[PDB]
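Consider the following assembly input.
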Amino acid sequence: YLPAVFEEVLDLVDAVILTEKTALHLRALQNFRDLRGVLHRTGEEWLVTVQDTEAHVPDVYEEVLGVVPITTLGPRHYCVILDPMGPDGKNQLGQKRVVKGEKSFFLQPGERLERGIQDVYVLSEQQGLLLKALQPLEEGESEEKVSHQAGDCWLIRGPLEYVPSAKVEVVEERQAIPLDQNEGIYVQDVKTGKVRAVIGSTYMLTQDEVLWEKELPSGVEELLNSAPRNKTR
Amino acid sequence: YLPAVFEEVLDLVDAVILTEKTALHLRALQNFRDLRGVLHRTGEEWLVTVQDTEAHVPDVYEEVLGVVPITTLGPRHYCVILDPMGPDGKNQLGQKRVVKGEKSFFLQPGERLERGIQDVYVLSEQQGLLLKALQPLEEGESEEKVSHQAGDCWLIRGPLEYVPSAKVEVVEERQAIPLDQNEGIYVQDVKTGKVRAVIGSTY
C-alpha cells in the first residue's frame, strides 16, 4: 500500500486467528458497522467466532478486550453461568443458568461461571442427595413432577445422575447404612420428633430423619460381655 | 473544529460510556434542555442510562455527580430502598420500599439501600420467623390476609420463603424442637401466663 500525502501510517495490525476452540471478545469504541454488517453501539461488547470469520482484524472501531477459550462441558459435567445473556441480547443480572449435556459454548460478554466446570452428580443405590428448595416452584424441574415449596428439604435417591437446578441446593450426601435382621438404627423424625428405631434391611435417612442417641443407665458394661459403643444404631 | 476569533477553547470533554451495568448520575447546574429534550431545573439530579444514550457527553449545563453501578437483586434477594422516588419525580423522604424478585435497577438520585442486598428469608418445616407488626394494617401484605395490629407479634412458619415488608420487622428465628412420645417442653403462654407442658410430637 502506497500512503497518500495525508495518511500518517500507523502500526500494521495483524488478524487474530480464530479456531473453534477460541473466540475473540471485543468492545466497540464507538458506533459503526462491522465487516459482516452488524450494528454496534458505543460500548457494546460481543464475540466473534469461526462462524463469522476465521481470521479477524481488530478494527479501528473495536478494542479487543481479549480472547476467550471455549468452555466445554463433557458428557458428564455442568456449569452455572452467572448473568446469562437472554434473547434480548443483554446480561440477565443476578440470575443464573445451569448448562449441561456434552456442550461446548463461549462465555458471552458479562457471563461468568459460578464455580466453573465442577462435576455432574452420580449416585448409586446406596447414595442419596439431601437437597433444599430454597427457591419455590420446582414443578417441571425433573421427572418427579412433585412441586417442592420454598425451603422444604427432600432426599433424592436411586441409581441415577443429577444436576442441581438454580433453585435447588445440595445440602448433604446421605450415604446409606447396611443393616441385616436383628440390627437397625435409631431414627428420630425431626418433622414430628417421633423415634422409630428402624431395623431390618439396609436403610438411609429420609429428608427429616436424624440418628438419635440412646443413653443407657450405666447398664452397658454388663451387656457388652475398650471400644465405645455406637450408641446411635 | 476551527475556533472563532472569540471562542476561548477549553479542555476537550470525553463522553462517558454507559453499559447496561452502569448509569450516569448528574445534577443540572442551571435551567436548560438536554439533548433528548427534557426540561431540567437548577439543581435537579437525575440519571442517564443506555435507554437514552450509549455514550453521554457531560454537558456544559450538567455536573456529573458520579456513575452508579446497577443494583441487581437475584432471584433470591431483596433490598429496602430508603427515600424511594414516587411517580411525581421526588424522593419520598422517611419512607422505604422493599424490592425483590430477580430485578436489576438503578439507585435513583436521593435513594439509598437500607442495609444493601442482604438475603431473602427461606424457612423449612422446622424453622419459623417471629415477627412484630410495629406498623399497623398488614391486611393485603401476603396470602394470609390476616390484619395484624400495631405491634402484635406473630410467628410465620412453613416450608416457604419470606420478604419482610417495610411495616413488619423480624424479631427472632424460632427453631423448632424435636420431641417424641413421653417427652416435651414446658411452654408458658405469656399472653395468659398459663403453663401447658406440651409433650408428644415435635413442637
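The two ends of chain A are 86 Å apart (CA to CA). Ask yourself how this observation constrains the way the partners meet.
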